[PDB]
């Protein structure tokens, strides 16, 4: 069943509303799991689709040096390559 989940925020960009959107969404199977910096609601039958949402972040620090913001974990099947997938915050 759907187990892997990892997404963090940009460096000092601290989250305020992500708690709200964590609490909000609940679709046919639910755990309300949350690890105090993350969000964990994935469990379901075999699912191959994706969905959409919107989340932004609160500002703790003025500056951002040019070093991109990709938080990538990747583990989906033993045989194929485990399939990294990246794109930077072009604000840099
Ligand atoms: C998703 O992929 C699997 C691969 O075996 C397939 O069996 C299944 O019919 C597909 N559809 C869903 C959403 O389960």
From Swiss-Prot:
<comment type="similarity">
    <text>Belongs to the protease inhibitor I39 (alpha-2-macroglobulin) family.</text>
</comment>
<comment type="function">
    <text>Is able to inhibit all four classes of proteinases by a unique 'trapping' mechanism. This protein has a peptide stretch, called the 'bait region' which contains specific cleavage sites for different proteinases. When a proteinase cleaves the bait region, a conformational change is induced in the protein which traps the proteinase. The entrapped enzyme remains active against low molecular weight substrates (activity against high molecular weight substrates is greatly reduced).</text>
</comment>
<protein>
    <recommendedName>
        <fullName>Alpha-2-macroglobulin</fullName>
    </recommendedName>
</protein>
<feature type="glycosylation site" description="N-linked (GlcNAc...) (complex) asparagine">
    <location>
        <position position="48"/>
    </location>
</feature>
<comment type="subunit">
    <text>Homotetramer; disulfide-linked.</text>
</comment>
């Amino acid at each position: 069943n759907m187990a892997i989940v990892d997404v963090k925020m940009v460096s000092g960009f601290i989250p305020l509303k992500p708690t709200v959107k964590m609490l909000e969404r609940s679709n046919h199977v639910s755990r309300t799991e949350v690890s105090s910096n993350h969000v964990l609601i994935y469990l379901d039958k075999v699912s191959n689709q994706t969905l959409s949402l919107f989340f932004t972040v609160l500002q703790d620090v003025p500056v951002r040096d040019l070093k991109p913001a990709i938080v990538k974990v990747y583990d989906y099947y033993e045989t194929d390559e485990f399939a990294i997938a990246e794109y930077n915050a072009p604000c840099s």
